[PDB]
């Protein structure tokens, strides 16, 4: 489907943000 | 912080995605 | 529609820019 690239990029960005969020939760 | 702001922006873009159509 | 799509794509690029700054700081 035509929106596929955008959706994939969004999922990848969330994957990256999840990693930052988990790091911060610990780090504090 | 900036990270939490990006989480909000990302969650807004997930909402907008649901509205998007190519038709 | 096309306008919403355009804005979304631009916001995505900005989001990736923003996440990169956070990633580089963490690394």
SS3 sequence, A9-21? HHHHHHHHHHHHH
- How far apart (Å, rounded) are the C-alpha atoms in residues B21 and A8? 16
Q: How many CB atoms lie within 10 A of CB B14?
A: 13
Q: Is C25 on the interface with B (CB under 8 A)?
A: no
- How far apart (Å, rounded) are the C-alpha atoms in residues C11 and A24? 24
- How far apart (Å, rounded) are the C-alpha atoms in residues A21 and A11? 15
Q: What angle, 0 to 180 degrees and rounded to 10, lies between the N-to-C axes of helices A4-27 and C2-26? A: 30
- Are A17 and B13 an interchain contact pair (Cβ–Cβ within 8 Å)? no
Tokens of B7: 């989480």
CB < 8 Å to A6, chain C: 8-9, 12
Residue C12: which of A10, A16, A20 has the nearest Cβ?
Answer: A10
Residue C19: which of A6, A17, A23 has the nearest Cβ?
Answer: A17
Resolution (A): 1.9
Cβ-count burial of A17 within 10 angstroms (0-12 exposed, 13-18 middle, 19+ buried)?
A: buried
Please tell me the total number of residues recorded for chain B in this structure: 23
How many CA atoms are closer than 13 Å to the CA of C6, on its beta-carbon side?
A: 3
Sign of CA dihedral A2, C2, C9, B6: negative
- How far apart (Å, rounded) are the C-alpha atoms in residues B5 and B16? 17
């Amino acid at each position: 489907h035509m929106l596929d690239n955008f959706m994939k990029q969004l999922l990848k960005l969330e994957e990256s943000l999840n990693k930052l969020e988990l790091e911060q939760k610990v780090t504090n | 912080g900036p990270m939490e702001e990006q989480r909000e922006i990302l969650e807004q873009l997930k909402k907008t995605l649901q509205m998007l159509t190519v038709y």
